[PDB]
Amino acid sequence: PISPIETVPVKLKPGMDGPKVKQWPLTEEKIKALVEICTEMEKEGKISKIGPENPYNTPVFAIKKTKWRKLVDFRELNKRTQDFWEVQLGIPHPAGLKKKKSVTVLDVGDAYFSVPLDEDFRKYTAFTIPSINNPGIRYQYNVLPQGWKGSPAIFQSSMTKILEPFAAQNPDIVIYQYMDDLYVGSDLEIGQHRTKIEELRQHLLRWGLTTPDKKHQKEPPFLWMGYELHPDKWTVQPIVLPEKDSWTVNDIQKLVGKLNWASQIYPGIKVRQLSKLLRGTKALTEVIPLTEEAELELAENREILKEPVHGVYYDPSKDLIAEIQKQGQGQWTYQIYQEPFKNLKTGKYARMRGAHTNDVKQLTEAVQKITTESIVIWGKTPKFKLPIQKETWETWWTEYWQATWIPEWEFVNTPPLVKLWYQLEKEPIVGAETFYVDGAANRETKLGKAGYVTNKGRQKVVPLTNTTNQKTELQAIYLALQDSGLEVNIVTDSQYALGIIQAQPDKSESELVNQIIEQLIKKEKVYLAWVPAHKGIGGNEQVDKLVSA
Amino acid sequence: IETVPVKLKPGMDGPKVKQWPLTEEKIKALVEICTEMEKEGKISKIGPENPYNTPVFAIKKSTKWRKLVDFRELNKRTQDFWEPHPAGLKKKKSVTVLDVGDAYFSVPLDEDFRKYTAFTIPSINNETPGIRYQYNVLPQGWKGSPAIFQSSMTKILEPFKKQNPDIVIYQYMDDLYVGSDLEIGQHRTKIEELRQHLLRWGLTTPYELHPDKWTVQPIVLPEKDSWTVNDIQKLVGKLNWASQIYPGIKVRQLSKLLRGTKALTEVIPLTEEAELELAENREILKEPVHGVYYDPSKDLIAEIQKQGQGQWTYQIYQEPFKNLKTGKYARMRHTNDVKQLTEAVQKITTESIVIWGKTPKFKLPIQKETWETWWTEYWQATWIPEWEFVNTPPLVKLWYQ
Numbered sequence: 001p002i003s004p005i006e007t008v009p010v011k012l013k014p015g016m017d018g019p020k021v022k023q024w025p026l027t028e029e030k031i032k033a034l035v036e037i038c039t040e041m042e043k044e045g046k047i048s049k050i051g052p053e054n055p056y057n058t059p060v061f062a063i064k065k066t067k068w069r070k071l072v073d074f075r076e077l078n079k080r081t082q083d084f085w086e087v088q089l090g091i092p093h094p095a096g097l098k099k100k101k102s103v104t105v106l107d108v109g110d111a112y113f114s115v116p117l118d119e120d121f122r123k124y125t126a127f128t129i130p131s132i133n134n135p136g137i138r139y140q141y142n143v144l145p146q147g148w149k150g151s152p153a154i155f156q157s158s159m160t161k162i163l164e165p166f167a168a169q170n171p172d173i174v175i176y177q178y179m180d181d182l183y184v185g186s187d188l189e190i191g192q193h194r195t196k197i198e199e200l201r202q203h204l205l206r207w208g209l210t211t212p213d214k215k216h217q218k219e220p221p222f223l224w225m226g227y228e229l230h231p232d233k234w235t236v237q238p239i240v241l242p243e244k245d246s247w248t249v250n251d252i253q254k255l256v257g258k259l260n261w262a263s264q265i266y267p268g269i270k271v272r273q274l275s276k277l278l279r280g281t282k283a284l285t286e287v288i289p290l291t292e293e294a295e296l297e298l299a300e301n302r303e304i305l306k307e308p309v310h311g312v313y314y315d316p317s318k319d320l321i322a323e324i325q326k327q328g329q330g331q332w333t334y335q336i337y338q339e340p341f342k343n344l345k346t347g348k349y350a351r352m353r354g355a356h357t358n359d360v361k362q363l364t365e366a367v368q369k370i371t372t373e374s375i376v377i378w379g380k381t382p383k384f385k386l387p388i389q390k391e392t393w394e395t396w397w398t399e400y401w402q403a404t405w406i407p408e409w410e411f412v413n414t415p416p417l418v419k420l421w422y423q424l425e426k427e428p429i430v431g432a433e434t435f436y437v438d439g440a441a442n443r444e445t446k447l448g449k450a451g452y453v454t455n456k457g458r459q460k461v462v463p464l465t466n467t468t469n470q471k472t473e474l475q476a477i478y479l480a481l482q483d484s485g486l487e488v489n490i491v492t493d494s495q496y497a498l499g500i501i502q503a504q505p506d507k508s509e510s511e512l513v514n515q516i517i518e519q520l521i522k523k524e525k526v527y528l529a530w531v532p533a534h535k536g537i538g539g540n541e542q543v544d545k546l547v548s549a
Numbered sequence: 550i551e552t553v554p555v556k557l558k559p560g561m562d563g564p565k566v567k568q569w570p571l572t573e574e575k576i577k578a579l580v581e582i583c584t585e586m587e588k589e590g591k592i593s594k595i596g597p598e599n600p601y602n603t604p605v606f607a608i609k610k611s612t613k614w615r616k617l618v619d620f621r622e623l624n625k626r627t628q629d630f631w632e633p634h635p636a637g638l639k640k641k642k643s644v645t646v647l648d649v650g651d652a653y654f655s656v657p658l659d660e661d662f663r664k665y666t667a668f669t670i671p672s673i674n675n676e677t678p679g680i681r682y683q684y685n686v687l688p689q690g691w692k693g694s695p696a697i698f699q700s701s702m703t704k705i706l707e708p709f710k711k712q713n714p715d716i717v718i719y720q721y722m723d724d725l726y727v728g729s730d731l732e733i734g735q736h737r738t739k740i741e742e743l744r745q746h747l748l749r750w751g752l753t754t755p756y757e758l759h760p761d762k763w764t765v766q767p768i769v770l771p772e773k774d775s776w777t778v779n780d781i782q783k784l785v786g787k788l789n790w791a792s793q794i795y796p797g798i799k800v801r802q803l804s805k806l807l808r809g810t811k812a813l814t815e816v817i818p819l820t821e822e823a824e825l826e827l828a829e830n831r832e833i834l835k836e837p838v839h840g841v842y843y844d845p846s847k848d849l850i851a852e853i854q855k856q857g858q859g860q861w862t863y864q865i866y867q868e869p870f871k872n873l874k875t876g877k878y879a880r881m882r883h884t885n886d887v888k889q890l891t892e893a894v895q896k897i898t899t900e901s902i903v904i905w906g907k908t909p910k911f912k913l914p915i916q917k918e919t920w921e922t923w924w925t926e927y928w929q930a931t932w933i934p935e936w937e938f939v940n941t942p943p944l945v946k947l948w949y950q
């Protein structure tokens with residue numbers, strides 16, 4: 001048990017003293033269980049009886065949930081002890097584990113209780129077994145208490161230092177550490193490996209760390225952190241999408257949770273319409289009525305989850321490869337693999353990063369997400385097989401005002417291909433009618449109008465209810481598209497509307513912009529020009545006076 | 550051999566910044582570098598009782614790998630301790646940058662402050678919690694290091710400044726800026742004398758600038774043989790923009806040439822009154838702006854626009870429409886947007902150090918994660934400015950073009 005390991009010095013937060021949380025009375029039966037557990041733990045050196053001078057206390061409890069166990073509420077001591085180097089939050093991803101002929105799982109028993117606790121800090125762990133009479137069996141810890149803030153980081157650290165020696169004289173045995181577990185892999189003879197396991201066991205037993213014997217060592221399949229690890233494959237654990245008549249905010253959060261979890265291996269998971277439902281969200285209790293698109297999305301997810309799927313492990317010897325496919329409006333899906341149909345993992349990307357975007361922008365963002373994830377999981381970036389042609393992407397990233405990093409990729413011709421649905425003109429169009437557009441709205445009555453005046457002498461005003469100056473300026477552009485031929489010059493004074501159209505979106509949150517896009521696609525040539533308002537520039541002044549009167 | 554006590558600003562704890570994931574290659578390069586630095590006593594491994602952290606990066610300044618520490622957060626949290634600049638440095642004809650950061654590793658760091666220099670070499674795929682170190686000596690990149698070393702630096706440079714009184718020497722973090730009005734060959738000789746002087750006194754040293762040729766680029770108006778309605782509308786819109794900066798600009802005669810409701814491609818003869826108005830507006834743009842004064846208490850801000858074909862415009866200001874400096878960088882293309890932006894940022898920051906002695910806060914036209922992924926691939930400087938990520942496309946591009 002207790003080890004000859006060096007201790008970590010620990011301090012309380014500056015200006016803070018130890019906890020003095022008084023103890024609550026306990027059932028005579030719980031007082032008895034605590035007395036026999038504490039005498040067994042004092043017997044092992046884990047705790048020690050203390051004099052009456054210790055002014056600190058931490059409440060102690062006993063439950064059986066037979067096997068009575070002692071639980072200590074360290075909340076107050078934790079609030080008072082210094083921060084530590086954050087223990088491992090992220091866990092390894094199954095798709096980044098390197099395949100190994102042999103894998104062993106060691107559970108370290110009573111992990112925390114095997115590591116000593118800084119001497120100067122032990123007085124602050126004091127606890128008291130209650131006396132029915134009130135009397136008072138004061139104790140204090142000599143090892144890492146369970147539930148204390150420092151135990152995970154200090155046990156972690158200690159185990160790293162303990163393992164260093166064996167690792168050095170065994171540089172061919174991979175030893176993952178994670179909580180009170182160790183996962184040991186090797187490419188040796190089941191025999192050699194076993195022997196090396198038994199060595200590590202006895203080495204760890206020399207530092208007070210008990211570990212499991214073959215007859216007690218866990219066996220594959222390994223149910224670990226929501227995964228299923230087989231010798232040659234991995235997948236996620238059973239996902240049960242509930243069936244309910246009514247859905248609360250909380251039910252939807254759990255639902256997109258499980259679906260986000262399933263998307264790392266099940267290709268084609270879509271979650272966007274469902275998470276659209278949680279926009280203002282509010283209380284997790286509010287019933288949120290489902291949209292038809294959220295119903296279809298959920299229904300397509302259940303179809304996908306009907307078939308079992310698995311991922312493979314990593315061979316640092318083979319290339320890393322990523323493919324991306326469009327999965328509907330704004331929804332994308334990707335696979336990462338080394339062998340053409342044996343996926344390391346999958347994922348999705350359905351962010352608009354704005355009210356409006358276009359396919360090429362979203363694909364580039366998808367590639368970005370894949371790049372970041374590849375560096376996390378494998379320490380490198382993959383090769384990209386993408387359904388877009390060089391001319392499409394080169395035209396976009398050259399004309400795009402934002403700096404972009406486009407990897408080296410290979411066009412894979414697998415419809416739907418990513419394309420530019422339209423391209424605005426760069427120079428005014430000869431022979432095309434020139435529409436001077438403007439809109440206006442009353443910021444109080446919310447009423448408004450959109451209108452044009454052209455160079456052929458045509459004028460028009462359409463009325464609008466419940467609108468804003470921004471929306472009418474888009475409606476004026478939409479109106480000029482509606483009433484023009486296949487080639488049209490449009491002149492607006494709206495920096496707002498110009499910015500939206502110049503960005504060349506092909507999908508939007510607003511149906512008006514979606515309508516404008518349909519018109520832009522049906523046109524052959526559109527040129528959009530801008531002029532400062534209220535400067536008496538010809539054509540612009542006529543529509544202003546028109547939509548103003 | 551004796552340490553200089555270092556403090557953090559009152560009521561402020563050490564840095565706790567996330568270490569960014571790195572490729573296997575950059576991690577391997579950091580382990581090699583840190584193993585050697587640990588053998589030399591410069592860094593020591595730390596235990597779990599140290600909660601602080603500062604990010605580290607593997608860069609190249611360039612065939613061998615170099616370690617770069619992002620002490621931006623620690624510099625903010627100790628600045629009282631490290632917070633003169635000579636106004637003549639921008640006037641000099643040639644200015645050479647010397648990397649003198651290796652001299653910091655001669656000086657031990659205050660033992661009570663070392664824990665704040667903690668950093669982490671990350672693992673791949675969270676296999677290991679990461680390798681932890683702190684600094685035993687003054688680290689490169691910490692603003693406290695040139696401040697503690699300052700007396701030794703004055704002492705070593707005193708003979709050389711005695712010999713060369715007209716030569717300006719400014720230090721900013723790990724670099725020395727050395728300005729002269731001499732001819733280029735005499736300048737590089739004076740630079741080499743200063744190198745050898747530093748080298749024979751135990752300061753190891755591995756950039757020629759010419760601020761005498763910098764300027765706030767004047768607004769430029771098009772010159773065309775034939776103007777369309779569209780060209781006049783662009784012209785009027787750009788002049789209308791500049792009139793927020795230059796008050797005397799008028800567009801009445803130019804916009805009069807468009808009266809009516811005209812086809813955008815219709816050719817408009819540039820009449821006399823309009824041509825005079827345009828000629829007058831070209832003259833007022835040649836003269837500079839007024840009231841644009843630098844304030845040392847306010848943060849410098851840099852905006853940058855992609856112009857295409859390798860060109861990038863930038864403006865440095867502290868208050869909107871009060872540019873202290875404007876500029877246009879070009880790239881003689883193996884190039885890409887990120888390479889050109891990374892380079893422009895370093896050029897702008899160097900220009901800003903020379904002129905005002907501090908780094909500006911950048912508004913970068915790039916997606917955050919793309920910048921965070923690739924910025925080290927072309928970063929050669931030893932400092933790192935603040936930055937944020939923006940869009941602002943509208944017409945800013947064509948007006949500064």
Ligand SMILES: CCC(=O)n1c(=O)n(CCOc2ccccc2Oc2cccc3cc(C#N)ccc23)c2ccccc21
Binds near residue numbers: 092100101183184232
């Ligand atoms: C190939 C045979 C086999 O059973 N497994 C296998 O190859 N992998 C992939 C490589 O994974 C490891 C490499 C070195 C150390 C341990 C490895 O296994 C694990 C890594 C990380 C976490 C683990 C958690 C558990 C649990 N519970 C078990 C093993 C882990 C395998 C991965 C898992 C299980 C079997 C194999």
Ligand SMILES: [Mg+2]
Binds near residue numbers: 438439
């Ligand atoms: Mg208007």
Ligand SMILES: [Mg+2]
Binds near residue numbers: 567603605667669670
């Ligand atoms: Mg770090």
